[PDB]
Structure formats: structure tokens, C-alpha cells
Amino acid sequence: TAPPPHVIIVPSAGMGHLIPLAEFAKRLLPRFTFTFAVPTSGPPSSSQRDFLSSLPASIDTSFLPEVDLSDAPSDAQIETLMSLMVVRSLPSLRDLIASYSASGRRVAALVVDLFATDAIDVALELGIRPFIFFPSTAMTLSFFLHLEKLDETVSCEFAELSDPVQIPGCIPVHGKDLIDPVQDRKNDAYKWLLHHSKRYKLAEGVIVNSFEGLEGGPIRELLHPEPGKPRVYPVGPLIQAGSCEKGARPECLKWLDQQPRGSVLFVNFGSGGVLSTEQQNELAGVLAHSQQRFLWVVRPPNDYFSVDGEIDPLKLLPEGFLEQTAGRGLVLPMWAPQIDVLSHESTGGFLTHCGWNSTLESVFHGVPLITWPLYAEQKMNAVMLTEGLRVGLRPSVGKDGIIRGAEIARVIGELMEGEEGKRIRSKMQELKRAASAVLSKDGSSTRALEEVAKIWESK
Numbered sequence: 001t002a003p004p005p006h007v008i009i010v011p012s013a014g015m016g017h018l019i020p021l022a023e024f025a026k027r028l029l030p031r032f033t034f035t036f037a038v039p040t041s042g043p044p045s046s047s048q049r050d051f052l053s054s055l056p057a058s059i060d061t062s063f064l065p066e067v068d069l070s071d072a073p074s075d076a077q078i079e080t081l082m083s084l085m086v087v088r089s090l091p092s093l094r095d096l097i098a099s100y101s102a103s104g105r106r107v108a109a110l111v112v113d114l115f116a117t118d119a120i121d122v123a124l125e126l127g128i129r130p131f132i133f134f135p136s137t138a139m140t141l142s143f144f145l146h147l148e149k150l151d152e153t154v155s156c157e158f159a160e161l162s163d164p165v166q167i168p169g170c171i172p173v174h175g176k177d178l179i180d181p182v183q184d185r186k187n188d189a190y191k192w193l194l195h196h197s198k199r200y201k202l203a204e205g206v207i208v209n210s211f212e213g214l215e216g217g218p219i220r221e222l223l224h225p226e227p228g229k230p231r232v233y234p235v236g237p238l239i240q241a242g243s244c245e246k247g248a249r250p251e252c253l254k255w256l257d258q259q260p261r262g263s264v265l266f267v268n269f270g271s272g273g274v275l276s277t278e279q280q281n282e283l284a285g286v287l288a289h290s291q292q293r294f295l296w297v298v299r300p301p302n303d304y305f306s307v308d309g310e311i312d313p314l315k316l317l318p319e320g321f322l323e324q325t326a327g328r329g330l331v332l333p334m335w336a337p338q339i340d341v342l343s344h345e346s347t348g349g350f351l352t353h354c355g356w357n358s359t360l361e362s363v364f365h366g367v368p369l370i371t372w373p374l375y376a377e378q379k380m381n382a383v384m385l386t387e388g389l390r391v392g393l394r395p396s397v398g399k400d401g402i403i404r405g406a407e408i409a410r411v412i413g414e415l416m417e418g419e420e421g422k423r424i425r426s427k428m429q430e431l432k433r434a435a436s437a438v439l440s441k442d443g444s445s446t447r448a449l450e451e452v453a454k455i456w457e458s459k
């Protein structure tokens with residue numbers, strides 16, 4: 001029995017990033033031990049502590065001493081605050097790695113999230129193999145690697161372009177659908193994104209949470225060796241599992257058991273996927289007059305109370321909405337067991353914000369999508385899902401930023417009924433089979449994990 005090498009993980013801010021990073025680590029146990037070296041700007045939340053403490057013993061956590069970000073503009077985007085958090089935590093990261101190295105442990109790799117490339121300098125100075133973990137699409141990774149060239153060939157704001165932007169190996173995308181932090185090139189968020197994208201070549205490999213069956217074009221382009229381009233390791237789809245391992249007995253799953261097969265539309269924009277009052281009313285009015293069964297996770301709009309103290313969103317729904325939907329739809333406040341809903345046989349569609357974790361969970365369970373992108377790279381994901389793979393439908397937004405009921409109803413109807421919705425469903429089942437094929441004991445993604453593991457163990 002050999003001593004397990006140690007691996008340090010530097011995540012970018014967000015539970016959405018801890019989830020796929022923990023799944024990645026869990027699939028390399030017990031060959032290594034891990035430490036989540038978590039930059040902080042304040043007391044770690046109870047959600048972070050609870051999630052990280054629930055992991056296997058071989059994955060430890062160190063919350064780095066909090067840094068001060070009050071000097072940043074109050075309008076600073078999240079990419080800027082995330083980059084500032086890492087840079088200012090590097091001394092603490094050095095002290096953490098020193099505690100392990102001083103005890104005799106071999107530190108075999110430093111895994112940094114997509115906006116934590118400034119920690120790569122520490123790894124290079126200490127003879128530690130730097131790797132980047134990319135929790136988004138291969139399409140978005142290609143955009144990152146191409147951003148330098150795009151920045152030097154385009155002077156105007158991207159949303160002003162008439163022709164769609166062409167990324168090597170990707171479907172074209174109009175500038176207005178490019179990731180949020182490139183929509184204002186004067187903002188620090190764009191400069192930070194440019195900064196990180198030029199540093200991906202400093203890593204010995206990029207680990208991307210996707211697979212070739214889902215993004216053939218981008219993956220095959222990325223795998224093609226080129227000078228100045230890092231090696232890429234598709235290891236997706238890395239997602240959490242259902243609750244059938246503890247002991248369809250949750251309340252909302254009992255309702256799904258009664259409904260017909262593949263007949264329910266699941267609505268969930270995820271935490272932070274808040275709608276305006278006007279936008280939520282448009283969605284509620286369509287569901288109220290529809291004959292479509294739905295399961296809707298509702299959150300208080302950004303513009304009385306419940307048992308714990310949070311505002312009760314289902315009392316903010318329009319007049320007698322719960323009367324018009326009593327037997328056909330089910331409303332849930334704040335949270336729902338998403339993976340258990342997507343795995344349920346009664347679930348036929350998923351209205352999602354196109355966060356990549358949620359998309360991968362839907363693909364793995366063969367549930368076609370209504371793509372309602374909100375922020376980050378979600379609009380790029382929507383284009384790839386709907387115009388590329390054709391496994392979902394996208395409602396068009398109006399000039400005032402509101403998606404009207406006529407569009408919500410159009411895509412719902414076309415997806416759950418209509419012939420195009422059947423083709424979409426058929427295509428999504430093909431991706432479902434392809435997803436479980438790359439994660440098998442001898443799967444394409446399981447092999448990529450092996451390559452990474454052996455590299456970490458080499459020398």
C-alpha cells in the first residue's frame with residue numbers, strides 16, 4: 001500500500017463550483033487525498049460548511065483567512081470579486097501547502113477553478129503540477145482560448161456585431177449571447193476574463209466537465225494538439241446522485257408517481273434565478289390556463305411569510321392561481337430535489353436557466369429542455385442546446401427584457417405536444433445513453449480520469 005499523494009483544490013466562489021469539483025475528487029479516491037483550499041471574503045456560510053463536511057474523509061477543507069474586498073466598486077461583477085479573492089489569498093494558499101509539504105506529504109497537483117489561474121504561479125514555484133478544472137461547456141472553454149484572438153480582431157462591443165461570432169469547432173453565436181463578462185469590455189470583469197484566458201496555457205491540462213457525445217465539435221477541436229494550447233481532459237458528466245441510496249417517498253415525488261409517464265414539466269431556475277414580478281406573472285398566467293401538468297419551484301420576485309421566516313412566494317402568485325391549477329400543477333417554495341425529479345419517469349420536460357450542472361443532470365436523465373438562460377454563460381449554453389444538439393426550445397425575449405406568455409406557451413406546447421417535441425425527446429434519449437456510456441467502468445470519461453491520475457502519480 002503506497003502513501004496517497006495530496007492534491008490541493010482552489011475553487012471559484014459558489015456552491016455551483018464545489019459540486020462538480022467534489023464529484024471529480026470523489027472519483028479519484030482513495031488514490032489521493034484532497035484539501036479544498038477555499039478563499040473567503042467573510043465567514044464561510046453554513047451551506048459551504050455542511051456540504052464540504054459531508055464529503056468522504058479523504059477530502060478535507062481549509063477555509064483560508066478572509067480577505068477584504070470592501071475596496072472594490074459596489075457594482076463590481078462577480079468575476080472581478082472572484083479574481084480579487086484568489087489573488088489576495090495566495091499568501092494563505094502558500095502557508096497551507098507548506099503545512100503539508102513540511103510534514104513530508106507529497107503534493108502532486110494543484111487544481112484551480114476557471115477564474116483562479118493566479119494560483120498557478122504558486123504551483124509552478126513549488127514544483128506542483130498545475131491543472132485547471134473547467135465546470136462549464138467545452139464550447140465556453142473554446143471561447144476562453146479564442147478570446148485573445150477575438151479581442152485583437154474586434155474593437156467594438158460584441159453585441160454590436162452584425163455577423164455571429166465564430167469560435168473554432170463551435171456553432172456560431174451572436175455577440176448578444178456571449179458570456180456576461182464580455183458584454184462591457186471597459187469593465188474590470190472583461191479584463192480579468194482576458195487575464196485568465198491567456199494563462200490556461202500555463203497548466204499541464206484542463207479538466208472539462210463535458211464529453212464528446214454532447215459537444216463533438218468543440219471537444220475534437222480542443223483535443224487537437226497545437227502550440228500554446230493546453231491538453232484537455234473531458235471527464236463529464238460529473239453530477240450528484242439521487243436519494244435512492246439512503247432510505248419516490250418525498251412529498252413532491254408522491255405526486256409524480258400518480259401522474260402519467262413523461263407528462264410533467266419541471267420548472268426551476270435555480271437559486272439566484274429570481275424573476276421580476278412582471279416576468280413571474282407572465283409565466284404563472286400561462287400555466288394557469290394550460291392543460292400541461294407542471295412542477296414549479298417558486299421564489300419571491302425582486303419586483304405573507306412562512307414558518308421559518310422567509311417570505312412566502314406562493315402567496316405572491318396572482319389571484320387564485322392555486323385554484324386554477326389545483327389538481328394539474330404543484331408549486332414548491334425555494335427548493336426541490338432536482339435530481340430525483342429529473343430521474344422520475346413522469347417528468348417529461350425541464351424549464352431551466354441552463355446552468356451547466358442542471359443541464360448535465362437533465363441530459364444524464366434524458367429530460368428535454370426549455371432553455372431560459374439568465375446569466376453567466378447560460379445564453380451560450382442555450383444556443384448550443386437548441387440550435388446545435390436540438391434537445392430543447394428557447395423562448396424569445398422582448399426588447400424590454402420580458403419573455404411574454406405567448407412565447408412561454410409556444411415552447412411548452414411545442415415541447416410537450418407537437419411533432420418537433422418528439423424529435424427533441426428522441427435526440428435527448430440518444431444523449432442519455434451516450435452519457436452513461438462514458439461513465440461506465442470502461443468509459444471514455446473514466447479513461448480521462450485515469451490519465452489525470454497517472455500523470456499526478458508520475459515522477
Ligand SMILES: O=S(=O)(O)Oc1c[nH]c2ccccc12
Pocket residue numbers: 014016078079136140179180181375376377
Ligand atoms: O457561477 S457563475 O455565475 O456561472 O460563474 C461565471 C460567471 N461568468 C461565467 C462565464 C463562464 C462560466 C462561468 C461563469
Ligand SMILES: [Mg+2]
Pocket residue numbers: 043044045046
Ligand atoms: Mg462560519
Ligand SMILES: [Mg+2]
Pocket residue numbers: 262348349368415416421425
Ligand atoms: Mg418529452
Ligand SMILES: [Mg+2]
Pocket residue numbers: 016270354355356357358359
Ligand atoms: Mg446549475
Ligand SMILES: [Mg+2]
Pocket residue numbers: 078180181375376377
Ligand atoms: Mg455572470
